Nucleic acid binder design. Structure first.
Lengths: 143, 177, 262, 206
RNA sequence: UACCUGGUUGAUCCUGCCAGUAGCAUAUGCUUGUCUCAAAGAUUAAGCCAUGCAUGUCUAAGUACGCACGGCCGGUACAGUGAAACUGCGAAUGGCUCAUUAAAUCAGUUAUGGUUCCUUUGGUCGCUCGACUUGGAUAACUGUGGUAAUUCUAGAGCUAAUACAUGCCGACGGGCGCUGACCCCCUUCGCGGGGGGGAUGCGUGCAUUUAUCAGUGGUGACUCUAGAUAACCUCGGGCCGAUCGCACGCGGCGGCGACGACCCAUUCGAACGUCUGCCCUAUCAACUUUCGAUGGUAGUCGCCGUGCCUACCAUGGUGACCACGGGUGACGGGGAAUCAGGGUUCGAUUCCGGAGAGGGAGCCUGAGAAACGGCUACCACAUCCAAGGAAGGCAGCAGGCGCGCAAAUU
RNA sequence: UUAGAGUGUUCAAAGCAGGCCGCCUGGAUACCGCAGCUAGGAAUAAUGGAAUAGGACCGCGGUUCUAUUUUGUUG
RNA sequence: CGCUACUACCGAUUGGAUGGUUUAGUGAGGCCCUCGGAUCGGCCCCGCCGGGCCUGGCGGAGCGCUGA
RNA sequence: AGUCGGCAAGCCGGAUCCGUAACUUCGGGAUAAGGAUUGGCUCUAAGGGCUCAGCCGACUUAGAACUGGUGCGGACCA
């Protein structure tokens, strides 16, 4: 399950060594009407970069994209498609920008093609600067 | 090239000298520089040696044991005067100052007295009486404003509850409608 | 650069100072103070380019070192002091009191006020700080940290402080119906009633302001400054009353004034 | 000197950046403190803004806290037993944040035996000779007895926790960054966290 | 003003280019009376530089025993100017240049709830439980000197602090929590239960570090602000005033300032980040990676966020929507030239931003510099020498050389 | 800067001034794409919904925990 | 094919030259750390004493201690 | 430079980690060329059987610290 690292990982705020005779998970409201998912409150995972159970504050911009890869752990890369307008030829051109977003494990089931809504936060790594806020399941794909 | 104390050689070396070292005077603040200073070990490769007599012998040299030049200036700090003339912590100290009569051509003889520093004067006590008065008004201001504010949120005490006295009073009237 | 800036070029100065670009290369760099460099007005400009009391740069320095200009109950001797918005500039020699409030344009108007109105001024609170021992604080828009305020004075209100005593007397709550004095942007200098408030979580909240003549405009909440209850202000307004008559009417108003006096 | 910049390394695609400005002062990095155990030796360094950081180089005492008991006493550090980051930091005993250290139990045992006055530690067969802690056991007033003996409701401590009170060494975790704050503070391991590191410590023996 | 004409043919109609035509700068030639504006060593050589100057600064208010001048009412010290020196502040702005640099710089847009900030402004500054003013150096100055030579300094006598150290009475008389000697009241056969006070000692301000406990005031959202408890308090120690000038009125009390600081705001910023945007090139199609490439965990360092770095793991990341590589006679932008409508070309150049001071590198001081009209190296170049050494940085203003088609007054 | 309002710099290029026998006024305005923010429109062009119904509504019945208002106060 | 001129190309020469980027060695200098301890202090120690254990002066040595 | 002629002698040498051209029958060239490392000692990590824990078992690789007059394929082999 959890505690698969050298250090004992735990939510740094809650105190789990009160004298007795389960555990009070910590989770915060994220704001902007984003409903904290059920598993972020009932699940027992521990991630410091989760927007619901970690020390990251969502701010700045709120974008959206589509998932393309998940081989990276705790992190996926989405693809933002847009149309750049060139003045001379009064036309457009498809352009794409793939960015790496942190996927907190509160979103258990999410596949390639699902549309996620990301939110800017402080730099989590060398390239990651966004966090997955909500996951809209792809078109159809009810099977 | 002068010789720096404690270098343990007789040759010559170059050293980074800073604020505090010898043989160097910094121009800008925090400036350092290389300087070729000579070793401390005395040898034949010197031009001058500065010697200072520690204990005077039995004989008397006509050059240094002869001409005595008195102290250039007297003590200037007030406390240093008390230590010089063996004076008490209470007696006057102003008349015990070492003044010097200055005499030259073209001017009539005056006598110059240095200004005694760190001496207790009523100007100081007037200065000391002022800051403690400022300490008084601050304490006064703090107890006044906090107590004034104390009755003021208490002015909103019965102003905040008396409105909720109307909120649940309708909550029972809303139940009977 | 390798540190903070200290000069200001004559061209890069804010335009509402109305500095001509033929006199000198530089501009009076406002020393740091209670207002930002853009919204401020260096008193070297208020005396040389607004009242024509002085002519050169040396001349205002001679004036200010006479201990003659009293800003908000305090006398300053720095010519580049940033006299911002609603700073009462009182002068004891001529017995005159000035209050820096915006013209209907973007410029600062030279408002002459009666002396008994010069002993107070309005300020916009910015946040409600809580001191290290449960001591409430508020910071006005001119950086006046006033401790022990009234509990009801919230973040976006205005307060009527008295200059000589530095104490709050009364405050206007921010809500629809109160007057406002837009300070910054396109509507800088408009005076109207507030009709609607639009919430935008995270971004800036925009507030709709109806003028006295019914041409309603909109501005973000940061650039708004209430000045009065209902439609009657607490400050003496300049000419125009902050309406910004359209450019069609500055032409007929000016041309009617030509042949009216002749 | 050693700088901590982003532009000296490759881009996300893998392309090489080309530096457009030489090393800047605000991108400074300093040599690591690598504080050890021993008599207190702290060098203060001036940092950005005319402030000071405290480079602890050798530390012996530390203000550790006992969570469940809501107690904390400045005890002396004994040894470094475990380090998640680098296995070489326990060999060369170095104190950095989040390190399992050993501290003396006496500043805590004498508290628990003054608040609860029970036989904490003290393996059976030998008794206190100076008789001072015996003064802590008896001669209470009858009125104060009933508030004292109701402290026996929560006088129990974990079997794992009292076991290391026999040796007099408690396992504590460092919480302050000593190469920055100059102090080496922390808390006492308890419950699952204590039970976890014991599994990681014994597994090192083999 | 959305415009064309000559030239292939024996002649014709075409395709089609060549040549005319008009701006716009750069040079150049010839010529030149007045007057108002005004660019001007960018292009080649970010090549090299003689000389001169370009950053210093004193108020009544930090230190005044230089008669260096100078007042006489002096013995109650210093009239009052004041060179010098110490101290404080600034020297990190400005000015110059465009070599580097192709999602970099830069622009618009936002974030700092991820950080620092001299100064200004406004708050704070007898909360903390034990002196009517403390300590010893040093400069100027006197004298003795050295070296061919410098804004080189050595030695000896003195002598100041708002320099450098040290440190208190007062507020302070008790309060508030913890130890609690002990004492008192009711009931109980009785141990028992409740209601109390309480000597004595201890801890008791903010800031710092860590741990734990409840929701004064906040935000869209805090692990926020405030509150409580247990401790910690860096000797290369966080403050809590051993300063200064004018009036002076009532044992001592009072005005007006100046300076000084801890801390919070504020201003000035700075520093990183978000989204979108950049020229030519495929005779550049794959690139990056245990020499960090992409993530995870824990740290180290840093003002802070982050592979910034380290350890241990994972095997990723980018690309035909042009990655990567190369070129640029590429600083970016606001803009400029030229146009009917579209465009094309330029932007070294006075505004903003960046970069750099011969080339790289390292660093002191400070709030702020990887500073160059600051240091330390090496490389290149070059000056003075007594041959031992010393000293240098015009892409500042002038000026000279060089270079050139090409650019002004020491 | 460009466009552009006002203004006899003797005109103009300029400049931001100036005008009346102390007063009277100016120092406007427009455009500044592309991206981002705000409000309206719903043609056009994309995209989605329920056909193994895990569909929508309407009331339900049970299960688990929980704000509690309540049990006069003390559990 | 032959004459003349010019511009590019192939070409032995492990051709040459000038830039750029570097691998590896050696590595100045600063910075940090661990030491170092020149030199400068003060305390303590007693003897000689003037004032009523405290003080001012004279010398010493352990450098016994401590600090830079 | 000796000599007809580098004859003879010498240099090179193992392994590990890097790196490797012309040319080519595409297989090669190739141990191309050219570099770096190598001792002793004290440790850490990883790699298995038998009944989560306990009990047995072997060798081998990588990394780190310390250390010696920079010496370490110390002879041999090459």
């Amino acid at each position: 399950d959890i505690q698969t690292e050298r250090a004992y990982q735990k939510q740094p705020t809650i105190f789990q060594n009160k004298k007795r005779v389960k555990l009070p998970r910590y989770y915060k409201n994220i704001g902007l009407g984003f409903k904290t998912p059920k598993e972020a409150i009932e699940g027992t995972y521990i991630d410091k970069k989760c927007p619901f159970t970690g020390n990251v504050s969502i701010r700045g911009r709120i974008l959206s994209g589509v998932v393309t890869k998940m081989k990276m752990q705790r992190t996926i890369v989405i693809r933002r498609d847009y149309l750049h307008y060139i003045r001379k030829y009064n036309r457009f051109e498809k352009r794409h920008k793939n960015m790496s977003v942190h996927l907190s494990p509160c979103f258990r089931d999410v596949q390639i093609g699902d549309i996620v809504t990301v939110g800017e936060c402080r730099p989590l790594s060398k390239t990651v600067r966004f966090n997955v806020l909500k996951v809209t399941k792809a078109a159809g794909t009810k099977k | 090239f002068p010789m720096k104390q404690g270098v343990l050689t007789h040759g010559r070396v170059r050293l980074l000298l800073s604020k505090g070292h010898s043989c160097y005077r910094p121009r800008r603040t925090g400036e350092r520089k290389r300087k070729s200073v000579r070793g401390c070990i005395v040898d034949a490769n010197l031009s001058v040696l500065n010697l200072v007599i520690v204990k005077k012998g039995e004989k008397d040299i006509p050059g240094l044991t002869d001409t005595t030049v008195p102290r250039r200036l007297g003590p200037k700090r007030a406390s240093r005067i008390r230590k010089l003339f063996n004076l008490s912590k209470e007696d006057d100290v102003r008349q015990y100052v070492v003044r010097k009569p200055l005499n030259k051509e073209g001017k009539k003889p005056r006598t110059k007295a240095p200004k005694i520093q760190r001496l207790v004067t009523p100007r100081v006590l007037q200065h000391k009486r002022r800051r403690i008065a400022l300490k008084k008004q601050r304490t006064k201001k703090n107890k006044e404003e906090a107590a004034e504010y104390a009755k003021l949120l208490a002015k909103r005490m019965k102003e905040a509850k008396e409105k909720r006295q109307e909120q649940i009073a309708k909550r029972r009237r809303l139940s009977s409608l | 650069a390798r540190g903070p800036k200290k000069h200001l070029k004559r061209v890069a100065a804010p335009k509402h100072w109305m500095l001509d670009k033929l006199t000198g290369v530089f501009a009076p760099r406002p020393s740091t103070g209670p207002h930002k460099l853009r919204e401020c007005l260096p008193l070297i400009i208020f005396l040389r380019n607004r009242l024509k009391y002085a002519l050169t740069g040396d001349e205002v320095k001679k004036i200010c070192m006479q201990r003659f200009i009293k800003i908000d109950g305090k006398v300053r001797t720095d010519i580049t002091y940033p006299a911002g918005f609603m700073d009462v500039i009182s002068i004891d020699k001529t017995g005159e009191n000035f209050r820096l409030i915006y013209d209907t344009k973007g410029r600062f108007a030279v408002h002459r006020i009666t002396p008994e109105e010069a002993k107070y001024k309005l300020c916009k609170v910015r946040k409600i700080f809580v001191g290290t021992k449960g001591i409430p604080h508020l910071v006005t828009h001119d950086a006046r940290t006033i401790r022990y305020p009234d509990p009801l004075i919230k973040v976006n209100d205005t307060i009527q402080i008295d200059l000589e005593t530095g104490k709050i007397t009364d405050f206007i709550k921010f809500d629809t119906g109160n007057l406002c004095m837009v300070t910054g942007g396109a509507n800088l200098g408009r005076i109207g009633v507030i009709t609607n408030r639009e919430r935008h979580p995270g971004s800036f909240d925009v507030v709709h302001v109806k003028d006295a003549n019914g041409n309603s405009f909109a501005t973000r909440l940061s650039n708004i400054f209430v000045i009065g209850k209902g439609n009657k202000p607490w400050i003496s307004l300049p000419r125009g009353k902050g309406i910004r008559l359209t450019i069609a009417e500055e032409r007929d108003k000016r041309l009617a004034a030509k042949q009216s006096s002749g | 000197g050693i700088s901590r910049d982003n532009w000296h390394k490759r881009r996300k695609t893998g392309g090489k950046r080309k530096p457009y400005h030489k090393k800047r002062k605000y991108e400074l990095g300093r040599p690591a403190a690598n504080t050890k155990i021993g008599p207190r030796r702290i060098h203060t360094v001036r940092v950005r803004g005319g402030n000071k950081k405290y480079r602890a180089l050798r530390l012996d005492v530390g203000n550790f806290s006992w969570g469940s008991e809501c107690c904390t006493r400045k005890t002396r550090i004994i040894d470094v037993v475990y380090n998640a980051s680098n296995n070489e930091l326990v060999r060369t005993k170095t104190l950095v944040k989040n390190c399992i250290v050993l501290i003396d139990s006496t500043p805590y045992r004498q508290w628990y035996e003054s608040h609860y006055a029970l036989p904490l530690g003290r393996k059976k067969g030998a008794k206190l000779t100076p008789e001072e802690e015996e003064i802590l056991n008896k001669k209470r007033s009858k009125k104060i007895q009933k508030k004292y003996d109701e402290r026996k409701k929560n006088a129990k401590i974990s079997s794992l926790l009292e076991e290391q009170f026999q040796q007099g060494k408690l396992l504590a975790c460092i919480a302050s960054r000593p190469g920055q704050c100059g102090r080496a503070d922390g808390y006492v391991l308890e419950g699952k966290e204590l039970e976890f590191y014991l599994r990681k410590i014994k597994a090192r023996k083999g």
